[PDB]
Design a protein around this ligand. Structure first.
Ligand code: HIS
Length: 391
C-alpha cells in the first residue's frame, strides 16, 4: 500500500568487485601522513576501508621515491595500487596545434618505445621498493589534456596495438575524462590492442547515467577489468565535504557506477582534501561516509548481483554477494524527504538477520536495530535523506 518491493537475485551474478579508494599525489599536494594512511586503508571503526590506491607516474624519475611510503603502507593494509601518468618526460614530448589552440603537448611518434621503457622503469622501481603495481595506465585523461599530454583515439590505438604488449604490468587505458567511448572503441575493436589491454579505466566527470552502460565492452571485454579511476562529485567546492544533503550525490554516483556501469572499482580524486572523503584534519567527511557505505562492507572479491535498482522514486538499491558463504551486502539510498519502507525479497537465502548502519545529516554509520526476515523477505525502513548498508 505505502510499501515498495525489491528482489535481490543471488543467482544472477554481475561484476566482481575489485574495490574502492582514491588518489595520493605527494608532489602536487602533501602526502598522506602515517595516521591518514591507516584511516584510509584500514577497515576498523572510523576508517574508510579503501582497497585501491591510485598514484601518479612522475615525468621526473627523481620524484618517484615520494610515492613509496604511502603505496607500501596501502599494500600492507590489503590494498592494490594503480599508477597513472599525466606527461611523459619532456624530452619525449612535442608541441602541436589542436582545434586552433597552439602549444599543445603530445608524445612524439618516434618516442613510443622510449615511453614504454619509462613506464617499465617506474614499474621496476616500485617493485624494487615493495610496491608491486596492479596496473599502470597509458595516460590520464588523454582527451582533456589542455594542461597535460593529449592522445587522439588513433594515437592511443597505435600505442595499445604496437607498444603496450611490452609493458611489464597490467595495462590500463584510456582514462577518458567523461568515459567517452570514442577513446576506447578503437581498442576494443582491434584484436591486438584488446589483447594488450587489461583494464578499461574511465573517469566520470559529467558522465550521465545514460552514458554509463557500454555495450561494446559487454560484447568484447571478456577477461578485462572495468574501473572508474577518478572523479569528485558533485563539485570540488572548497570546504564542501560535509554539505548535506549534497553529499548524497556521492552515494548516488557510486550506486550508478556499480549498477548502471557495471564498474568493478570506484576511485575518488584526492583522498585528503576539503571536498574529499578525508578532511584536512584527518577525519572522515560526509562525502567519505558515503564512500564508506560501500567500501567498508563490499569487499574485494564480492560479486554484484541483480537487484531491483530503483524500487520507488528517490530510492536506489545495490546488492553484492560474498561467495564464501552466500551472504549479501545491500546498500540502499533514500534521497526522499519522506521515509520509505521496502519489502526486499531474497529468494533462496538462508540468512534471516541483517545488521544495518545508517548515515544522515546528523549521524554517521550509526548502527541501528537489526532486521529479522519473515521467510526470505526483509522489510526495511529508510529514514528520510539517508544511506543504509545492510550486512
Ligand atoms: N582531477 C583532474 C582535473 C579535472 C577536472 N575535470 C576533469 N579533469 C586532475 O587534477 O588531473
Amino acid at each position: 500500500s505505502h510499501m515498495a518491493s525489491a528482489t535481490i537475485n543471488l543467482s544472477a551474478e554481475k561484476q566482481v568487485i575489485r574495490g574502492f579508494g582514491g588518489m595520493n599525489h605527494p608532489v602536487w599536494i602533501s602526502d598522506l601522513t602515517p595516521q591518514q594512511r591507516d584511516t584510509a586503508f584500514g577497515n576498523g571503526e572510523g576508517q574508510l576501508g579503501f582497497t585501491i590506491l591510485r598514484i601518479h607516474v612522475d615525468e621526473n624519475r627523481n620524484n618517484w621515491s615520494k610515492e613509496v611510503a604511502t603505496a607500501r603502507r596501502a599494500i600492507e593494509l590489503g590494498a592494490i595500487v594503480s599508477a597513472s601518468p599525466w606527461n611523459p618526460p619532456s624530452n619525449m614530448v612535442e608541441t602541436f596545434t589542436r582545434n586552433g589552440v597552439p602549444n599543445q603537448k603530445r608524445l612524439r611518434y618516434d618516442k613510443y618505445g622510449d615511453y614504454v621503457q619509462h613506464l617499465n622503469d617506474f614499474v621496476a622501481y616500485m617493485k624494487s621498493n615493495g610496491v608491486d603495481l596492479y596496473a599502470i595506465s597509458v595516460q590520464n585523461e588523454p582527451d582533456y589534456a589542455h594542461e597535460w599530454t593529449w592522445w587522439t583515439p588513433q594515437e592511443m590505438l597505435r600505442f595499445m596495438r604496437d607498444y603496450a604488449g611490452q609493458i611489464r604490468c597490467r595495462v590500463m587505458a584510456p582514462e577518458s575524462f567523461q568515459y567517452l567511448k570514442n577513446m576506447s572503441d578503437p581498442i576494443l575493436n582491434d584484436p591486438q590492442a584488446l589483447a594488450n589491454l587489461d583494464i578499461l579505466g574511465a573517469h566520470f566527470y559529467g558522465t550521465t547515467v545514460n552514458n554509463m552502460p557500454y555495450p561494446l565492452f559487454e560484447q568484447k571485454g571478456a577477461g578485462k577489468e572495468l574501473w572508474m579511476t577518478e572523479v569528485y562529485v558533485p563539485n570540488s567546492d572548497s570546504n564542501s565535504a560535509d554539505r548535506w544533503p549534497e553529499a548524497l550525490e556521492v552515494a548516488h554516483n557510486m550506486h550508478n557506477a556499480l549498477v548502471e556501469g557495471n564498474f568493478q572499482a570506484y576511485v575518488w580524486w584526492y583522498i585528503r582534501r576539503s571536498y574529499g572523503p578525508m578532511k584536512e584534519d584527518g577525519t572522515i567527511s560526509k562525502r567519505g561516509y558515503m564512500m564508506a557505505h560501500y567500501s567498508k562492507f563490499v569487499r574485494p572479491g564480492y560479486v554484484r548481483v541483480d537487484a531491483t535498482k530503483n524500487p520507488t522514486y528517490n530510492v536506489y538499491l545495490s546488492a553484492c554477494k560474498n561467495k564464501k558463504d552466500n551472504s549479501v551486502v545491500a546498500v540502499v539510498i533514500n534521497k526522499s524527504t519522506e521515509a520509505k519502507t521496502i519489502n526486499i525479497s531474497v529468494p533462496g537465502t538462508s540468512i534471516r538477520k541483517w545488521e544495518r548502519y545508517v548515515t544522515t545529516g546528523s549521524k554517521n554509520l550509526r548502527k541501528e536495530s537489526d532486521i529479522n526476515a519473515s521467510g526470505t523477505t526483509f522489510q526495511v525502513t529508510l529514514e528520510p535523506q539517508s544511506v543504509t548498508t545492510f550486512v
